[PDB]
């Protein structure tokens, strides 16, 4: 899911203001998003993984210099590592 809803409207409304507004992301929303990323791999819902990761990365990319650039690299690392062990490939968003 994302927090309590798999709705991309909810996912988006979480991720967007999170990445843009929160000066210092605490580990608890960071561990919930990484958990779902790896779980969407194993739950055969890499459709929703596509939506979540592409939106998350896009905002963390366009952020100039913040923790969000390190969070970009961390979350994207762990998801692609599970995905290459499970599905045997690493989705490059580009």
């Amino acid at each position: 899911n994302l927090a309590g809803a798999v709705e991309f409207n909810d996912v988006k409304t979480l991720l967007r203001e999170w990445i843009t507004t929160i000066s210092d992301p605490m580990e608890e929303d960071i561990l919930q998003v990484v958990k779902y990323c790896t779980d969407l791999i194993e739950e055969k819902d890499l459709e929703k993984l596509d939506l979540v990761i592409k939106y998350m990365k896009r905002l963390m990319q366009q952020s100039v210099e913040s923790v969000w650039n390190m969070a970009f690299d961390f979350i994207l690392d762990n998801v692609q590592v599970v995905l290459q062990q499970t599905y045997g490939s690493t989705l490059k968003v580009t």
Binding site: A3, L14, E17, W18, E28
Partner: peptide, 16 residues
């Protein structure tokens, strides 16, 4: 108990 500095997703978590 969790949240560190007021969770943004974990506040909107599966909890009502």
């Amino acid at each position: 108990k969790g949240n560190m500095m007021s969770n943004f997703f974990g506040k909107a978590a599966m909890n009502k």
